[PDB]
Amino acid sequence: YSIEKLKKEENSLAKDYYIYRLLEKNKISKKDAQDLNSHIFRYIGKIKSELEKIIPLKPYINPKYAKCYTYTANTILDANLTCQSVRLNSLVFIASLNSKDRTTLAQTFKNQRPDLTNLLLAFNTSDPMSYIVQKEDINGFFKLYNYSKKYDLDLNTSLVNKLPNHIGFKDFAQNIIIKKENPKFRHSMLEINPENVSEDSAFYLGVNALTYDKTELAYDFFKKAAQSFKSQSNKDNAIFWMWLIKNNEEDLKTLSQSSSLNIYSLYAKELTNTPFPKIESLNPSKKKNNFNMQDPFAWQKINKQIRDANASQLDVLAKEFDTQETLPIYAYILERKNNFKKHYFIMPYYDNIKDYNKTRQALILAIARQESRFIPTAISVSYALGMMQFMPFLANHIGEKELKIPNFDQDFMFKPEIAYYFGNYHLNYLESRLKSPLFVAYAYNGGIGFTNRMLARNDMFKTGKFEPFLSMELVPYQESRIYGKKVLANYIVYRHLLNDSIKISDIFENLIQ
Numbered sequence: 001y002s003i004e005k006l007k008k009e010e011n012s013l014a015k016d017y018y019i020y021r022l023l024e025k026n027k028i029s030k031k032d033a034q035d036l037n038s039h040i041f042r043y044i045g046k047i048k049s050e051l052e053k054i055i056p057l058k059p060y061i062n063p064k065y066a067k068c069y070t071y072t073a074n075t076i077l078d079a080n081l082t083c084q085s086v087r088l089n090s091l092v093f094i095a096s097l098n099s100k101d102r103t104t105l106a107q108t109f110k111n112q113r114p115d116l117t118n119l120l121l122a123f124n125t126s127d128p129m130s131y132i133v134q135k136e137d138i139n140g141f142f143k144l145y146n147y148s149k150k151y152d153l154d155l156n157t158s159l160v161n162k163l164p165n166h167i168g169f170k171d172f173a174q175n176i177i178i179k180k181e182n183p184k185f186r187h188s189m190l191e192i193n194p195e196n197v198s199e200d201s202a203f204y205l206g207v208n209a210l211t212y213d214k215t216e217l218a219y220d221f222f223k224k225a226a227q228s229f230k231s232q233s234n235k236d237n238a239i240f241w242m243w244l245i246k247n248n249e250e251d252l253k254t255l256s257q258s259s260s261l262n263i264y265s266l267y268a269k270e271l272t273n274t275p276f277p278k279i280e281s282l283n284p285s286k287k288k289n290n291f292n293m294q295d296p297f298a299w300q301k302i303n304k305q306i307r308d309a310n311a312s313q314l315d316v317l318a319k320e321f322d323t324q325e326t327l328p329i330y331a332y333i334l335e336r337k338n339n340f341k342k343h344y345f346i347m348p349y350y351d352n353i354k355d356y357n358k359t360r361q362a363l364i365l366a367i368a369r370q371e372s373r374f375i376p377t378a379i380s381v382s383y384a385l386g387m388m389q390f391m392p393f394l395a396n397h398i399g400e401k402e403l404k405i406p407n408f409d410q411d412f413m414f415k416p417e418i419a420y421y422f423g424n425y426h427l428n429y430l431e432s433r434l435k436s437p438l439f440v441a442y443a444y445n446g447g448i449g450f451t452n453r454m455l456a457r458n459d460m461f462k463t464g465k466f467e468p469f470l471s472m473e474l475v476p477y478q479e480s481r482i483y484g485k486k487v488l489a490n491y492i493v494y495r496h497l498l499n500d501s502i503k504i505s506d507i508f509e510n511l512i513q
């Protein structure tokens with residue numbers, strides 16, 4: 001794939017990947033790189049920092065306010081009033097000013113921009129946050145939080161109850177609760193009225209409240225989350241907590257009857273002797289079609305059609321891809337087509353794993369389902385590859401140093417046989433150190449580095465009233481917190497389909513040390 005043929009393909013993540021590959025091997029000339037901003041589906045991350053080593057284009061400042069960026073903290077009083085206010089959007093700039101210039105600018109702006117006045121006068125004190133808090137300036141609170149996480153202070157009921165009306169609130173609460181920072185912020189958020197929050201914010205405040213053993217407020221927070229959540233999975237997560245705290249049996253029933261298949265609905269079914277949910281069985285009789293399941297470009301194309309589709313087209317696509325060769329795609333289409341009400345747990349390219357013990361098959365299949373939905377040429381935003389979504393570094397270490405495959409290329413990860421083989425190899429590594437398939441899942445996504453760090457702490461995956469479920473809410477990376485829960489559900493299911501059932505309650509017992 002020369003830069004030439006790549007330019008003739010539609011903008012996609014596949015195209016990005018391949019451009020990235022030329023870049024990392026230094027095969028893109030400064031010539032080649034000229035018209036290349038335009039050819040890049042997602043100009044973020046390494047492809048951006050890599051292309052900016054060739055062409056450092058680091059504009060851009062708006063033609064109108066160009067004058068404004070010629071002033072510094074020394075000459076800002078020589079700037080017109082528009083320029084003054086523009087530069088005062090940066091708390092760093094404000095911090096850089098001297099105090100008497102802050103006093104002057106503060107008077108200048110008291111009328112029309114008291115937001116600026118409050119921050120200016122705040123930075124004339126030994127504690128800006130404290131000044132902002134006393135004024136109950138909500139916009140300013142968040143600007144200070146984004147400027148420095150290190151400010152921590154008790155907040156009264158009046159003030160905390162106004163914080164959730166700002167966009168910044170959700171991430172602010174998620175961050176400090178999950179990171180266990182800003183103790184005084186956290187303590188103060190116990191007095192947020194549940195009426196004033198919803199959805200994820202309410203859920204996180206439920207978790208907060210548990211950590212201080214305030215189970216009543218936790219319940220009310222979790223209840224409000226249950227009633228407002230958009231996704232059934234999340235709603236189930238919250239009903240679980242409602243139940244675990246108060247043990248109202250109408251809550252567990254509701255959860256056991258959920259259309260969403262997740263660890264909480266699974267657990268609830270097991271606690272109530274409810275039968276395992278229905279799993280669809282896909283066996284297309286037809287053998288193959290044209291489609292090249294090894295062409296990454298074709299996946300990106302067909303993936304776009306599938307997402308920008310309606311009744312008419314979906315049904316043509318479902319029938320087109322109703323073959324054994326294209327089964328992953330068939331399921332992908334069906335999953336969308338029936339609006340996620342049906343549960344699909346295919347086992348494609350089964351030959352490549354049928355000889356492993358059933359417990360290991362389930363783990364592999366569980367990872368692949370979450371990683372890729374078994375799409376062989378799947379590529380992530382970080383350029384992880386194939387069904388098992390290997391990062392290129394790791395794929396090359398295994399392929400070249402460890403397993404010594406002849407003529408190994410990282411694009412070998414697009415082969416089922418290889419994906420499953422390297423996955424098995426890497427899962428052997430992880431399971432041998434971690435034991436629990438939950439822990440393994442955490443480490444497959446976020447690395448064993450952070451997994452071991454988290455397990456070493458004495459407030460994670462130890463014993464306690466609400467364990468291990470609380471620890472699962474406090475996994476410090478969001479992507480990994482979610483990943484673990486989803487893969488664990490898939491694991492239960494696949495062990496079931498493989499005739500190697502386990503009670504999920506036993507998984508939960510062995511999460512405590």
Ligand SMILES: CC(=O)N[C@H]1[C@H](OC[C@@H]2COCCO2)O[C@H](CO)[C@@H](N)[C@@H]1O
Nearest residue numbers: 370371372373378379380381384389483
């Ligand atoms: C193709 C893709 O982007 N997969 C990502 C996957 O996204 C979910 C996929 C998207 O494609 C359809 C199936 O689920 O999330 C994982 C983290 O949970 C990532 N490590 C995977 O790389």
